[PDB]
């Protein structure tokens, strides 16, 4: 409010002490370091009660500190001469603000990922004199919290000290439950990759320890239910992010033992009537996410083993499942889906109210939360529920190019669709009509669709294929070893000779009067599309003799001497496609054309793609 | 203000939970549980077995003898005694099932997987001398099952593929080998979970000798490699170097270690890292030692990770007749296995990129072990890591940017991490870095640095607008990924308050730049700068450095 | 039982039923040549994780009761499982009479 202007001047004061030029990382300790008092002020104006509740002015407050540490890696390793570096004093002070903002998932994710930036790449300047001086300290405060966890058994524990001991344990869990991208190999128990860390078994120890603590304690507090839902949120978040996380298929897990751990953990949670609170979708989210992981894979039997549900039925009540209404609704939906795939589909039928298959229901109703949405702006919840309802329908499978054309031209496939020439008609009428000058993004989407669709045109005569059964390219997107230019075909079809998509390409793109300004984006996209077309297709004659560079070799010259290196290194890639054909490069004349072209660049920055183009 | 205790804390019987987990333990892919498959097993050559009141008759149900032992020792022992009782008893069981000429060893994979489930259930109570005994048992067990990892590179010209096309014995001992190495990995991670004062009970010379033999057996040179057991064998060394780093008395361990063990490991690591990852010939059988290719005839999940598709899953179930007591295997004709989606190839590439990440990771770890110089901190991690960095940058730029596979980001994270592997080797370990070997790699090192020094120009990005067009071009797969995560699998990814999608439109864009090979992070550009510019070695002269500065401008 | 070699569950493992080609009452699927005691121990381990003691008991009581029932009411079926099922059910009942419920006793 009054100090957001102070933060706006403060980021300018940070960028002022950058360097004499724009080149600044400055990893070492220089013998002005006057930003140390500001570094102190970043956290001494933070532990306060008034406007930390506001989101963005707190976000910029911690983000200016993030940019300061981003441009100054020597600030962690400055040797705060008590016994260590200052980063150990940084972590617990950071933890105080995170435990004041323990509950807001945005506020803790935004803090933990920037701490991951502060630890993963900043310690790498020093390593062994500092890596073990902080990866020990993480386990030191971890050991302190799990040590203090045990004296609540003997009952002499406090109340708020109990609370923030549990909460600090929770946040120390949550940091290390992150993905590999946030915390890399900077911390010595996350040193091992392949979904398989030292944090795995130590975490499976400490979660059983806090289960033992929860069975030891006896408290029905509302806030205890609130912090009780947090740990099951953490146990589903620990197993979600270690999945492989593919494009549109369900993200496959890596460790069936970690799966069984989270399943049996939340099952033992629910068995002891744990974690009940009003209007709280958290357990429902966990159940639905894990069932979404275990829809129809091999782990579905593992789900029905290590989380059984059959025994809480009570069919003959409006209160169907006991615990908390929306979570019990989610449980009913999971039970319904399990029953749906257990029963044969002849008993099932789809009612076309929500178009989902449903069996012969009940003598009573008992089917009100099965298919209805149940939410108070619970958007991820109903999308989970609608995926659970929709995935059984055996509908059209998710595909890359089909998702992209549904994103771009919505509702195209209310027709034949997989018929080939009509999507050519739609892309052609778009690339003739629906642009004036504002689609400097949408036309790039159009041409990347054209680049994949030209590959699809090449995939006929490869009389089997279809719109759906083509995720990626069997020639450009997959690759083999050795010389890739043996796999390409000499007598492949021509671009202008056969492919009407290249006729369209030459119509708009290769004849547009403002090739000199498309954009870097649209030049890159037309380079990608031309790359795929001349990969799958023979390029035309580059020169007949009357000047006459064929509007694409012209694009090679335009993007080849370009100011940016990316379009240089992309425009070099389409060059050997010119170097091979029959009936164009049969007697090595396009060969000598490219030779005397490559002999004609003494420009210093074009040496890189020049030499690569030679190779 | 004290929280009240629970007067009837029902501590569950942990050995009952462990026993129940044993009984319902089923591997991923087969129909029956593992115990029940063992119930479907006999052994008609060992006409009687007994070690310690573990009587097995001739046509006896083997898993019935197991569950007799289980229920008997449940009433008697506490948890660790129950564990290592099962460990040594099933170990002796596996032992004399192995050492017999006419005996089929179909029980052995399920016994090994059973024993793995025994070990990994409670590592807190599992005892390290039992780990040592079981560990040495698996090591000499694999030197018993010797000829599996020693099938030759090429067949003869008259090595006919006329054959009964059988797969049952091959499936048996592939599962034996793979589950064995998986168990070695499990032993060492639970031994890692054992505290940082308690390793000398596990470690002696025989540990290192047996693993050194089986490691040379695993990362083979003149034989066809099994990519499965390569994963396990390098993860073992990862756990080894990790606990060497994370103990205080590393001196006793490294004094137990002869440097021959190091320099025999590191050569096979170099020969592994100098292989290639190409999707179109993963599941093809091709030239050796260049293509970690994950052969079709061993394609299942494994005990820790789910490495493939597990095409062999129902074949594990059809290993047995399931209505009969037998020891001979049920039929698998070998070529009935085997065009829909090379996403299988892409995820196998994802595994192999994580593998090469682990290789350079343990290189990093051993450098941090030997901060001081030694026989193996000797400069070849400039050569081999620089060759890897240079090739995975050059044909990255040539082949991958615009190939829209999910593996692009991790493949260009490999170079991002081995840059630091070059970097701290350069800065902190310059003392051994010989004048000859830098000239052995003078081209590729300086060129690999320059491929980051070229990224300080910054004339591609400069905004938000066209960069998201470029991530539509190449990074629509991460768009799919983040829409699935933002729509299902993240608590913080809903009702975004206009500071956190700001972070998104920062980080997706720097990520897709890092894919597009221009605009790396400035710290990585600085780390490439402070080697080439640094006067610790005359990489360039000043009249040769400007010949590279002009190749940006400057 | 006193006199036979194997345990009762283990004898049930040696049992199938090739006339009732499928049985199911409440997720108690028994196939045609399925090992019957294997289906029992599937039920046992499944209801162990879920139910408390009396619910586990009368679950086993009614399930094995329905099992004995349709093994009985069939003309071509041999009823060799039935004595071991009855003795099994007896062992189920008499173990803890304190928790065993009287309506289950009545049924
Ligand atoms: Zn293509």
UniProtKB/Swiss-Prot annotation, chain A:
Biological function: Serine/threonine protein kinase which activates checkpoint signaling upon genotoxic stresses such as ionizing radiation (IR), ultraviolet light (UV), or DNA replication stalling, thereby acting as a DNA damage sensor. Recognizes the substrate consensus sequence [ST]-Q. Recruited in complex with protein LCD1 by the single-strand-binding protein complex RPA to DNA lesions in order to initiate the DNA repair by homologous recombination, after the MRX-complex and TEL1 are displaced. Phosphorylates LCD1 and RPA2, a subunit of RPA, involved in DNA replication, repair and recombination.
Subunit structure: Interacts with LCD1, which is required for localization MEC1 to the RPA complex. Interacts directly with the RPA subunits RFA1 and RFA2.
Annotated source species: Saccharomyces cerevisiae (strain ATCC 204508 / S288c)
Domain of life, per lineage: Eukaryota
Residue numbers of the full-length protein present here: 2 to 632 of 2368
Similarity field: Belongs to the PI3/PI4-kinase family. ATM subfamily.
Subcellular location: Nucleus
Name of the protein: Serine/threonine-protein kinase MEC1
Curated annotation (Swiss-Prot), chain B:
GO molecular function terms noted in the UniProt entry: damaged DNA binding
Post-translational modification: Phosphorylated by MEC1 in a cell cycle dependent manner and in response to DNA damage.
Keyword field: Chromatin regulator, Coiled coil, Cytoplasm, DNA damage, DNA repair, Nucleus, Phosphoprotein
One Gene Ontology term from the biological process aspect of the record: regulation of double-strand break repair
UniProt GO cellular component terms: ATR-ATRIP complex; cytoplasm; nuclear chromosome; nucleus
Keyword hit for Nucleus: yes
Annotated compartments: Cytoplasm; Nucleus
Note: Present with 606 molecules/cell in log phase SD medium.
Known partners and oligomeric status: Forms a complex with MEC1.
Function per UniProt: Forms a complex with the serine/threonine kinase MEC1 which activates checkpoint signaling upon genotoxic stresses. The MEC1-LCD1 complex is recruited by the single-strand-binding protein complex RPA to DNA lesions in order to initiate the DNA repair by homologous recombination, after the MRX-complex and TEL1 are displaced. Required for the recruitment of MEC1 to DNA lesions, the activation of CHK1 and RAD53 kinases and phosphorylation of RAD9 in response to DNA damage. Required for cell growth and meiotic recombination.
Protein's name according to its UniProt entry: DNA damage checkpoint protein LCD1
Lineage summary: Eukaryota, Fungi, Dikarya, Ascomycota, Saccharomycotina
Gene name, Swiss-Prot/TrEMBL: LCD1
